[PDB]
């Protein structure tokens, strides 16, 4: 058992550090679809995704979510991976739940917004981006993405201040802060 237990621990340790090739090498040796180990599948799944074995990765992740429906971390990376591969309709349901479940995860909220915007759900997108900007008011990329969503609905007045903020955030440092106490 001991060489197998070493490989599990070392493989997980590798997945956690970004040593994905090695994480695959070790954890393939110990993975078993027949007797589920959710730690092994999550980390091997991530590892497969990051080495370009995306279909095999997502499979492990889908199987892991099915088996532990409550695992926020599995849901998260599955959701985000589908956004990455432009499977937006799959991402959206996953990310909707994660965001409600982890309401300070800004990245999730932003990506949800991006997926919703790609699908042309301009209104829902705008809703998610506002929550996002409540979390991080000075993220230029949300201001830009929400301005584009508004613009597509013809809501130009609403877009404009966001277009301007995004541009000013690019240039850097906002001059008016010079007169705002901390």
UniProtKB/Swiss-Prot annotation:
Protein name, entry field: Magnetosome protein MamA
Keywords annotated in UniProt: Biomineralization, Magnetosome, Membrane, Repeat, TPR repeat
Function: Probably forms a large homooligomer on which other magnetosome subunits assemble. Required for formation of functional magnetosomes from pre-existing vesicles, it has a dynamic location in the cell.
Residue numbers of the full-length protein present here: 43 to 217 of 217
Family: Belongs to the magnetosome MamA family.
Expression induction: Constitutively expressed, levels remain the same over 144 hours of growth (at protein level). Part of the probable 18 gene mamAB operon.
The organism's taxonomic lineage, starting at the top: Bacteria, Pseudomonadati, Pseudomonadota, Alphaproteobacteria, Rhodospirillales
Record-annotated membrane-spanning stretches: none
GO biological-process terms attached to the record: magnetosome assembly
Subunit text: Oligomerizes into high molecular weight complexes (at least 560 kDa). Forms round, 20 nm diameter complexes with a central cavity. Interacts with full-length Mms6. Probably binds MamC.
Topological relation to the membrane, as annotated: Peripheral membrane protein
């Amino acid at each position: 058992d001991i060489r197998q237990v070493y490989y599990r621990d070392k493989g997980i340790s590798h997945a956690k550090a970004g040593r994905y090739s090695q994480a695959v090498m070790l954890l393939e040796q110990v993975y078993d679809a027949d007797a589920f180990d959710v730690d092994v599948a999550l980390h091997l799944g991530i590892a497969y995704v990051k080495t370009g074995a995306v279909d095999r990765g997502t499979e492990l992740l889908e199987r892991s979510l099915a088996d532990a429906p409550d695992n926020v971390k599995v849901a998260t990376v599955l959701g985000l991976t589908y956004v990455q591969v432009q499977k937006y309709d799959l991402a959206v349901p996953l990310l909707i739940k994660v965001a409600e479940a982890n309401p300070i995860n800004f990245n999730v909220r932003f990506r949800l917004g991006v997926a919703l915007k790609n699908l042309g759900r301009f209104d829902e997108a705008i809703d998610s981006f506002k929550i996002a900007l409540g979390l991080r008011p000075n993220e230029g990329k949300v201001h830009r993405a929400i301005a584009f969503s508004y613009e597509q609905m013809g809501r130009h007045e609403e877009a404009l201040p966001h277009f301007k903020k995004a541009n000013e955030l690019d240039e850097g440092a906002s001059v008016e802060l010079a007169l705002v106490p901390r």
